[PDB]
C-alpha cells in the first residue's frame, strides 16, 4: 500500500566547487543524484537530480593529498599497465577527478551506471545548460 510516485519531474542544479574539499562536495552531489533528498520513494527509479558541477578545477584537496593522491588505472595489457596520475595532474582533466569521486559514492549496478548520466562537470565557472536554469545549491546541512 506504500505510495509509488510517477516522476514527470526533471530537476537541474548548479553546485559550485571552489574550495570545497573534494570528498565533501562529492558526497553532497552523490546524495542529491541518488535521491535521498526529498522522500526517496522508490529505490527502483532514478528519480534523483541533474547536477552541474562548475569550477571543478578549483577543488581544494586539504592535506598532502594534492600530490599524494595517486589515481591508478589498468589497461588490459599484462605488460605493466597500472598507469598512475598525481591528482596534481587534475591539470590534465579536472572533471575526471570530480567525476571519479562521485561515481565511487554511487551504486555500482545497472541503475548506478545509468545514474552517472546525471553528472555534468565543467572545470570553468561556465556551462551550456542555461536552457534548464538550474537552481543553485549551498553545500552543507545544519543539525
Amino acid at each position: 500500500k506504500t505510495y509509488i510516485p510517477k516522476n514527470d519531474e526533471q530537476n537541474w542544479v548548479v553546485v559550485d566547487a571552489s574550495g570545497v574539499p573534494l570528498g565533501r562536495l562529492a558526497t553532497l552531489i552523490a546524495s542529491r543524484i541518488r535521491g535521498k533528498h526529498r522522500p526517496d520513494f522508490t529505490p527502483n527509479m532514478i528519480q534523483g537530480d541533474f547536477v552541474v558541477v562548475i569550477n571543478a578545477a578549483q577543488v581544494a584537496l586539504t592535506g598532502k593529498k594534492l600530490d599524494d593522491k595517486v589515481y591508478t588505472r589498468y589497461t588490459g595489457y599484462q605488460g605493466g599497465l597500472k598507469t598512475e596520475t598525481a591528482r596534481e595532474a587534475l591539470s590534465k582533466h579536472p572533471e575526471r577527478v570530480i567525476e571519479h569521486a562521485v561515481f565511487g559514492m554511487l551504486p555500482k549496478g545497472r541503475q548506478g551506471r545509468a545514474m552517472h548520466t546525471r553528472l555534468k562537470v565543467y572545470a570553468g565557472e561556465t556551462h551550456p545548460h542555461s536552457a534548464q536554469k538550474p537552481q543553485v545549491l549551498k553545500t552543507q546541512p545544519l543539525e
Binding site: 506504500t2 535521498k36 526529498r38 522522500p39 543539525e143
Partner: protein, 58 residues
C-alpha cells in the same frame, strides 16, 4: 519508510534521529513508520509533526 521519513525531516531542518525522538517525547505518538511516510505524501501535516517534535525537545 525510514528513508522517506528522514528525507521529510531534513526538508524542515530535522533528521530521522531527531524527528523520531522528538515525536517519541511528545506524549508518545506511536504512529508507525509506514504511517509517517504517507504524511510525507501530505506535507502540511508532516510539517506540524515536525514542529511538534521540535517542541517536546526544546
Amino acid at each position: 519508510w525510514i528513508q522517506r521519513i528522514n528525507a521529510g525531516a531534513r526538508l524542515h531542518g530535522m533528521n530521522y534521529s531527531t524527528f523520531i525522538n522528538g515525536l517519541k517525547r511528545a506524549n508518545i505518538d506511536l504512529n508507525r513508520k509506514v504511517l509517517a511516510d504517507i504524511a510525507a505524501r501530505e506535507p502540511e501535516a508532516f510539517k506540524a509533526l515536525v514542529d511538534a517534535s521540535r517542541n517536546a525537545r526544546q
